Design brief:
1 helix, cytoskeleton, part of a larger assembly, 4 chains, structural protein, mainly alpha
Chain lengths: 51, 51, 51, 51
């Protein structure tokens, strides 16, 4: 019984690892989009200075 | 319409997140259920032989 | 922008259908997998006694 | 040895449960930061309109 539980729990751990990898990749995408947005804000700030 | 676009795009993005997560657990649940089905059959054979 | 709103709402509708279908299928196989766990416990017990 | 290894993987599973939770709140927070810079851009857009 302990071997059965250990095997299924290791499988669950592998699934959890895959889920965190997905979440971290998509959070990285969110961070990159935020960073591009900030750079755009910078350029608009330069435009405002010109005005 | 711009505001409605923003809110719909956001909540659709959340829906895509949820569907990806649910698809991953579709896979894990179905695979584990198939493994336990194999275990059911093998214990069927074992108990038949022993009895 | 009206057309784009239509497209985004269509994607949202499809996502909301797939999410519901996934959740229902998940509930069915979740109950089935719990029942499978209990049944495998029973077979392990019968193997106990007969062995 | 089986009990020991099963306990270790139980602890690791709990740990990555906590890590997933953490990444979830942090992704929610950084999504809120995207939102905040979004209102910042709305204000700055009307500011450039006035200038």
């Amino acid at each position: 019984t302990a071997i059965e539980r250990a095997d299924q729990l290791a499988k669950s751990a592998v699934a959890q690892e895959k889920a965190l990898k997905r979440a971290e990749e998509r959070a990285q995408q969110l961070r990159a989009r935020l960073d591009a947005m900030q750079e755009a804000q910078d350029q608009v700030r330069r435009d405002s200075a010109t005005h | 319409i711009q505001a409605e676009e923003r809110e719909v795009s956001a909540r659709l993005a959340a829906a895509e997140t949820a569907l990806g997560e649910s698809d991953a657990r579709r896979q894990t649940q179905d695979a584990a259920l198939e493994d336990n089905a194999l275990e059911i059959d093998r214990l069927r054979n074992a108990l038949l032989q022993s009895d």
